[model samples]
Structures are given as structure tokens and as C-alpha cells.
Target: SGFRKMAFPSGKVEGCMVQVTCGTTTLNGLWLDDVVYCPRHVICTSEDMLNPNYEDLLIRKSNHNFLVQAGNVQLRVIGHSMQNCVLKLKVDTANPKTPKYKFVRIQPGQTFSVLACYNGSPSGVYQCAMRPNFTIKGSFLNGSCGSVGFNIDYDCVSFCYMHHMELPTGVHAGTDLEGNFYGPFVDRQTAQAAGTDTTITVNVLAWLYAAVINGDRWFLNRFTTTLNDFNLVAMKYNYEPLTQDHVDILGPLSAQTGIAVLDMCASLKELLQNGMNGRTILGSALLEDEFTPFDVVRQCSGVT
Candidate 1:
């Protein structure tokens, strides 16, 4: 709610690319290099009115302050230490006295990663602490980040004229041969690396709903087939079977009495037949037994 909106000339804008730099006070994964400001919006939460150090994105909930960005379904804490120590990741402390903590062991100069939490089904604060000192490394993102699109970076190793577009969010299931790292699904990749399954399920639902909104018969049919394939693969790999509850929530409502599916369909068909040129349905009702604003429903001539 404390973000400032800036406007620019259309000519100077140059697509949706914008360079966002934060104040000196920054955190690990709470920021990005070249963040996308188009196709969707980039919503940021800051610590205070002060400028962040560009590297840190700060989110403070209750009394706890965290320098973090939204990451995938799981929390992966990677760090390096000069001395033998344990790194602790604390999150979801609804009750101050009863907070969940994950500890990762580190040794010598080598970098180590801890699976802080595997389920990103909910959003909350994540804090890091270490004993005997450790340097936190790597970025953290949750699964929602992948399908919704944010902080996306396009690759440029091979030759290209110019690769630019409003990179849309997608259900990112990693790739073959190279796995999932070299793709547009940053949050999904984060989920997979963290061994979290909830994000994948969430994505499946998001995908289904989006298809329904599209209202394209072919798209829905294809999505249904895709769901079937997904279930088969999940069963083959011994993963949780896909459920249709997410897609079937709107199934039975179309068959009722008034404003039923059949009636609505016919209404829409008739509307299309009229080419949306006639009076609205409410306005048409006024044709019968309707008068000016001065008219009353019944006789109210002389009230005592």
C-alpha cells in the first residue's frame, strides 16, 4: 500500500522493461535485476519509506521483519560457513512462543542448502539465523511466482535479433535432458528443487480455471485430455492422483430452474442474434405497465 506509482512518456517506455533499483538496505531474494512491469504488475512490499539496497525486498508482518521475496512452494536455504555451524530457518510463527524452525548443517568453506520447508501452500514470513556464523547464498521464490509471472529473465546465449514479449505465466513442469532450470518457470523450478508437490497441484487448478474462463470448447477439450494425461503420469510415478474437484465446482449449477444453464444459453444465443443492438433485458421489461418516475406501485392518494 505504500508504493509510489510513476508515469512515463509512451515513446520513452520501450515495451514493459523497467529498471527497478532499491535503496541501500536490501535482502537476498526479495529483489531482482530486471523485473517485468507489464502483462502483469509487479507488486512490492518494503520495510519503510527509506530506499532499499536494491538487493533486499523487505516484508514485515506483525513485529517480525524479513528481507525476502515471494518464492515457490518450498523454502530452500542455501548458505556457506567458515566454521561448523547450523543454519536455522524460522517461518509461520503465528504464535510467538511456538514457531517452526528448520536447521541445516554447514561445514568449512563449501556451500550447503537446506530444505527449509517443502509446502508453499500458504504465504508468510521467513527468517534466517545461524549459529557460529554463516553467509546465506542463492535466491528464493515460491511456486505462485512461476505461474503468475514476475522477475522473469530471458536467455541470450545463442544468437537472436531481439527476444521481447510479455512473458506469460504457465504451468511449468521442468524440461527433458536439461531438466527445469533453463525455462520460464522460475517458481515451478524452485518448487521442484525443494521437493514440494503442493505448488504443482495449485498450478493444475489455475490452469483449469483459466481454460474455463477462455470459454473455448476446443481449449476445454484439450485441457480435459491434458488432465487425463496428467493423472496417468501421476499414477505411473506413484504421485498423488489428480482430482477433478477443482474443475467441477461449476458443473451442476447450469441445470436448475430459473436462470438455468439452458435458459442462459438460449438468452445468450438470442442476444447474439440481436447483435447486442436492442434495449437491455431490464429496460425491455419497462414496456409493460410501466410509467414515469412520479408513478407509484399502488394508490397512495391521501395518507392520514
Candidate 2:
């Protein structure tokens, strides 16, 4: 049944009432799970109207009708007449200052991507009005929605740039701590053989920390073993101990990697006291047989 205007002391239509029927079906022949009906003339009387506590609304399925109250007055109807109908929504993404809400129609099982960013930060809050039932899976800060729509908050941080560079000749390149690019090597062996001046000079601890944060399994495993090998070489050669410059670098790298730089410095001190001494220990590893590429890339020259 359609909405019926009710009489109250104010003479204006305070709310309407209706009963839900069961025979309604979508064009696809699926039974509507729930029906929500609202009167067109109903206007919000307060800013609080936008943030109603939905639990206050009573849904009496036994009677096939429900009461929706807004500011001490009742309005609208709730039923099971929309289970299979196409769902429409007003979607807003992570804009805090001025939100741009867009109308969207979603079909069952459809997948879409939404970018959420606010004020140059990867973190922000998003709202979708009139959202249908759906599940989302990803790396998000938080997500939840009321019966009307959904709200999802998210934050993102990257250990490396989103894109990497590669050449057609089976050579790939990456940057060192100084942001200097080096590579043309086909593999780690080639890069290692190219010498310190040509190969990408890597900071073993910093790279390992970055790999850990980035959740890069391949780099983690490779660098973990590299660190072990470096420990062995440092002990065998009795190389010069790590310098203040190396310790200074850790402070900034710690900021970038979100690891404690002071703690790592303490560990290095202990490692030196135990007769495992090295100046640029990893740099010395490059001098020995232990040159390995953090990642491989291809060179795209002189080939089809």
C-alpha cells in the first residue's frame, strides 16, 4: 500500500503508514527481500536528521508494517519488496573539505574500485548513501555501514615508489639510499661483477627494513641470507668498525622505514664488541663474492 497522510496538532503531514505485501518481485523473478518507502514531501527539520539512530525504528515483521520516527514525528514504511531490485547509491570518497557525492547503480556481484585520499594523506573517511548489501576485502583502516549506506576509512603508506623502471635488454634498475640509479645488469651476478661504481650500492639493513615493511617475501629472504653472509665476512676479515657516518644514516632511514634507528645502532655496537667488525660491512660484502641484486629488471634495447 502507498503512504497515507496522518493528522496531528500541526495540521501538516507529520508521517505516513503502510503495510508490506509479499507478492512483489523484481524483473528477474527474485522475491524482494525488503521494501523501504519514503514520502516525497518529507523534509528534514534538523541537522540531526542526517544522523538518526536507526535502532529506534521498530520493524514488526509479524504485522508487515514498521514505524519510522523523525524528530518526534513518524514517516515512511519498511517491507520486503526490494530484495532483487537494482540498488542505487550516492557515493562519496575521502574528501573532507568539500565532499563530491555521485550517484551510482550497482548490480549483484559487480566489482568496482574507489580511490580514497584526503588532503595529500592516504588516510580519509568515505560515505556511501543508500548502499546495498555487499562485502569488501582489502587493506583498509576500517569499514562499516548502516542500513541506508556504508562508511569506509582507509590509510596507505608505500615503502617504494609505485612504479619501477625496466629496459628491454633484460636489465632492470633501482635506486640506492642516495636515490642514485644504477643497473643494466641481466642478473645479480652481472650487477655484482660490475663493481661498486656501477652496481646499485645498497644499505643492507635499510633495504631489509624496507623489504619487511613492504611485505616483499623474495627480497626479505634474499637479504636475510645476505645479512648472515655479511656477518661471517666481517668476523673473518677483521674489517674496520662501522663509522659515525653509517650511524648517522640509520637515523633518517629509521624515520623512513618506521624502525628504531637507535636500537639498530646498539645492535651494531654489540656486533662489533663480539669481534664482528666492519666499516660499511655490506659495502665490503660487495667487494667479496657476495654481490646480489635486490631485484632483477630487463633492458629493452636492440631487440624486437
Candidate 3:
């Protein structure tokens, strides 16, 4: 949850009204003189709203983060009189190599929309900033307008990833809008279970290793496992396990496989359900790839 409160200027009534539209969903919020009153519906998804804390009436200025679903998001200022207000929006892009931000500015009465991808998706981050025109003099003005700035940080969720079999029935797995598998497990218990399961732990290790090799911070940072823990596990499971002391010396050797690890886990789960053994699966071409942990470990350990 990257949710936060929207900051405002130090004026008595230097604010405006705004409306947010995301596909079929629409919400209303107030930008008062010096504070923001966010719409209750815009704080989180319906699933998150079930929590009492997330159902609070108003968010403080200190809490500036907000969460939204992945889709075409539109923000418009529906109020009059604040025609001098300037709106700035920054959304994440899907580029992996040189991740960049999509920045845009909107004038008063103008409406703009941007497609917000989930946090774990190829996109980077999403946020918004609003600047008020201080040239107008009014009793609402309390201090210099230079010091006043408003911002709202956002964390988008697509809920496309596969979850573990142990997850609650309410937490179901699904695909994103683009038909890509993302997650089924986001909790520490599920991640640890996936790592400990002998049936698909090897594939999990390979997927994590691929993330490291490709420098995918989004994927690597999502799990609670530490790099040292991964090193120890690699040494224990590798066919020709590396010595404990030498495990630290090994490093990634190639690029990431486009294959999503969860998708592979889903396939593995089916095979195991049909009575397949871990050894047979690993030996087969089913999990074979040019950059598996086995190849990396063997190369690093000089086991040619």
C-alpha cells in the first residue's frame, strides 16, 4: 500500500473540487483551502475497504499515499474559480531496460487520463502533483505560495499473479488485462512455503535467480527472502552443491527468461498432483532453460 495524503497550500480557500474516473468507476474529493478531503471510494479497492482502518472518513496530510487498480485513470477539476490551478501527473511505463516516467500537465477545466499498471507490472511508479496560482490576492493567503505544494503517491494493483494453494479462498488468482500471469501469493508465509517446497523449490530458486540476473528490483524486492538465504539454499539443492564459503562468490551469469515463475509453478503443481516426482521433472526439458540456477552454479563451481 503506497497510499498517502494529498498536501495543499497554506491558504484559507485556495482549493478546488476534483473528480476521478477509472473506467466505469467515478469518485469525488475536495481540495480545500489548505487540506484535501479525498473521496472514500478512491482510497483503496473494494477488497481493501473491508478493513476498518482503510474505511476512515478523512486522511491526514501526512498520509499521502493512495492505491488504485490498473486501468485508464482520468482526473478532472470540476470546480470553478480556481481556473489558475495546474495539474501534473506522473505514471509508470512498461520499459525494463531504461524505465522512465510518463509526465503530463493539465490546465484548468481540462481532463487527462493515463493507463496505470500494477506495481509489479513492467511499469515503474504512479503519482500526482497540483500547483495553485499564487498571483491572485485574497484573505485565504496566509504565507508565500512558493512553499505550498500538493502531491499524492499511488500504488496500483492488477491482482493478476497466481497465489499459493494455502491462500484463503477469498484470495483467488487471476490474470492481468493483458493476459499475463502475475501472482497468487504476496504474503511471507506463502513465499517461504514456496521456497521450502521440494516439489517446485528448484524452479522458484531459478525464477528468483533470473530476477537477480536481470536486475529486476520489483520482482526481487517483493519477496521477504534475503540474498544470503538464497545463496545458502542454492548450495544445498544444487546437484553439485557449492561449498558454503564459496556460495557467496557465485553471481548471476545471464539475462532473465521472459517466463513468469508463477506460471511455471502453476504447471508444476498440476504435474505433482498427477504423481510426478521432483527428480524426474528437473531432469526433463520441462524446466530446462539456457540460464537456470543449475547451469549458473555448475559454471561458477567449475564443475564442467
The 0-to-1 C-alpha lDDT of every candidate, in the order given, reads 0.22, 0.24, 0.26
- Candidates ranked, most accurate by TM-score first: 1, 2, 3
Q: Which 10 residues in a row give candidate 1 its minimum summed lDDT?
A: 156-165
Which lDDT tens digits does candidate 3 get at residues 17-74? Answer: 2333322333332232222222233333445534424213223211223222122342
By lDDT, the best candidate is 3
TM for every model, in the order presented, reads: 0.20, 0.18, 0.18
Error of 1 at 20 (Å): 16
Steric clashes per prediction = 17, 19, 15
Q: What is the per-residue lDDT of model 2 for residues 52-77, given as tens digits with 9 covering 90 to 100?
A: 22223222122223233233333233
- Comparing candidate 1 with candidate 3, which one achieves the higher lDDT? 3
Q: Show model 2 residue runs off by greater than 4 Å.
A: 1-202, 216-240, 265-304
* Candidate 3 runs further than 4 Å off: 1-168, 177-199, 204-304
* True lDDT of residue 16, candidate 1: 17
